[model samples]
Target: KQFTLPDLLAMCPFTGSTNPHYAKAAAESSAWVNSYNILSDRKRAFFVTGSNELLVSHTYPYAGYEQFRTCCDFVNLLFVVDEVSDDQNGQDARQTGNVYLNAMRDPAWDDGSALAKMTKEFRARLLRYAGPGCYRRFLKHCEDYVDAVAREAEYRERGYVLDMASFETLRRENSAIRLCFGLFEYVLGVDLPEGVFEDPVFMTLYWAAADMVCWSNDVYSYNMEQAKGHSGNNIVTVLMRQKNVDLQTASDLVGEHFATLMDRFVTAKGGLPSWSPSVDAAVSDYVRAMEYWVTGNLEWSFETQRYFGVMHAEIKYTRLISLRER
Candidate 1:
């Protein structure tokens, strides 16, 4: 379950199933699979080139790695800089991960590029809204999950669901996904069209779906988390302690919570138009993409649970790739 680059390269674009040429890239991380993987390798290459085209390629490499921008499925290029810097905490943190959008922009974008300005405005607002408190809550959540992941073997002690290095397996699975998404963003310039971020409908739906994916991960993974000895031991095990709700009722409550989010997203998309397609189409795609992301991740969250583990809460807020500009 270790995430060497070879294991990462082997994933199918959509599902993260293993690819044939995965072993082509050495474990060094310095090498990248060539375009031949996209062109010549059947079942291994997702596409030859282009972002959406690559997405269509079915190679969902690095399925759950943290810097979810670099391990893309199609033709991807990674630039190794002498140094990558980030202004976190007002001090330059030597950046190691891919800052996907930043890599797509040209240096000349600093002053004159409207796209650059627009992107910055949207990203800044996104950061402003997903503030410090939310991050703290998320980090605590991750800690709880990681604790669960550490005890994965306990869940299968009965010889069925969990046993043998289950913890490591989950960790590697989650790690691969994170790495893939990071590579996806880093290689492709995913940007929202002008005014889309400001559109009230977009924000409402976006956050609602976002919240659903997060909580669903928590709820569905309850048993697994308990097995893994999650921090606070999670809610399922404590169902007996709570006076108001049984395990089923508590699970139902969580389902209802996520259902509300789905409704919110659907409701917000209601008024968008079919003609002048960019606006309406963008909204449509956003809704669909959110669903796909949520559905996929929630499945992972439930099945794998603690392997998604603990990390900075800032990670969830940043999970959103910039919306595709229609």
Candidate 2:
């Protein structure tokens, strides 16, 4: 049936072993993400094909840039414009390097405020850009995070820098994305495409597809992340580490949370967040897309540390897309 927090909790590796409460909380978080997928609508659908392409690039390194270029060209040729290169000015480059440095523990993070500001701004812009169905819930999640940060005594006492490193890295990447979309719009005639963002079916499909890629990545690497002494948990550890409010439940809390998220999303007419069709087809699409503008190759299976580093880039791209046309 529907995914729910309990279901996620049950799936967590440590729930039955030593941390049922954490398992429950992890489920809730996962469910929230699932709900986000549901609300993505046609975007979700679009992601199915696009994500498959991304996955392909992830699997094959030598051809990554070619794959990404092909995928972008297929979606919209405007991406071929020379001005849209990833090489930003020194400011942007430095910020990006700062984030990576933090991720690799090579530098100290200092601008937590900048990170907060960017996140808040991106959330606002996303609400503005997205249709009514997903906007409210997305904002709600953002607000919840804001409230959590404000109320965290430890965070407050410590200058609200408990996860400063993550934020620092995330912020620069987010800023880079904002910069990318701005360039894209300046060079291209439109923001996204006419049908892609506005079409419910496509949106849902895309989001679902993206969700599959993200979740699968997380699921497949849980153990490896654990071995590396990095952040990794089957739902349970994630919630506990975050010190979430509902970290003390049991029995597939993760599943139940996902179910709730799905329900909440569908209730808003956002539809189910899922990939489109078969795995083989998805994989094929992925392979074909990477044939054009290859980026980089991914090793077999993802690692938590790697994700932490990649998320910095992902956030930048996401925030970049959130830029509004002015």
Candidate 3:
């Protein structure tokens, strides 16, 4: 029997949004990445047409022109890294991840590779806007994401499938939402106080947002990943293995959990300890923008042919999938 999708459009609370500059920004960043000459011509054309650039635009709709353009480049880097690094073994995966973020750590630190050079540009441009503290924190968040990617490769190398709780931890890091959350402060030019970020309530809200992205993607991509025999990192497959459930049940559960996390995010927002009026405002904007990430990616998933091929729009309503059973 084939599987059915959970009604994610109903479960998700955030609505779709696009940065007004998405067209220009996506085009500009496409050109920028093409100039790097890292990916082959065919792969480069495939990637740009896939519409991954919509990610930063949808997530950072409120950012001003300069900040928004940088966000575009940010997503492009993430896209290129994932495309380039996916096939490397555990050790090489870690090494590749290190190169990108290490270049992020120091703009002048380059190994003369295309990846490092683009990252150095990103880092140098960011320095023009990010103050000492925010810049430092952004680098740390980027490193955490890279570490997650490397560890994910290691898990694959070992034939290791994480249990539910373990998957949650790694999924949060691999989702790249935390890295985007950090960019909220960068886009707005506000540095959230370290104390505020460390607060239990704030962390709770942060994880909930990350979970939304994790569960949403895991659910949306399950059929495709399952078809490809690469569902190991997905929450849907993790649930199927851990709970001894069928594919539909695991995917349905992920959608239900997405609703639960969405509720938690709104509830936890009230529990935050109010900082100075200045800081309080930034937190509000930051969290709200993170919500955009939750909504945006779900919407973006279908618009691209990456997952559903030409059936993307049709599947959004049908919510029904035919399996590629051999």
- Which has the greatest lDDT? 3
Reference-based lDDT, each prediction: 0.35, 0.30, 0.81
Candidate 3: stretches off by over 4 Å: 40-42, 324-326
Clashes of 2: 70
Give the candidate number with the greatest TM-score: 3
Report RMSD (Å) for each prediction in the order shown.
16.5, 19.0, 1.8
TM-score of candidate 1 versus the correct structure, residues matched by position: 0.38
**Candidate 2 structure quality by residue, lDDT tens digits, 220-242:** 33333333432221343444455
Name the regions of candidate 1 deviating beyond 4 angstroms: 1-188, 232-244, 273-283, 301-326
Write model 1 residue lDDT over 1-326, tens digit each, in one string.
11101111111122323223233321212133331221224322321211221231234333332112223221132111101111111112111121223423232334433323433342342333333433333234333333333333233232324322443244322222222222222222233444665567766765665555445544544443454334132333343344366555655565565666666766666765444555555446455555555555543332221322342132233321121121
lDDT of 3 by residue, 45-147 (tens): 6687778777777778787888888888888888888777666788988988999988887646789998898888877677788867787787788888999
Relative to the unseen true structure, what is the Cα RMSD of model 1?
16.5
Output the lDDT of residue 152, model 2: 32
List candidate 2 stretches off by more than 4 Å.
1-94, 97-192, 232-236, 240-326
Per-prediction count of colliding residue pairs? 32, 70, 0
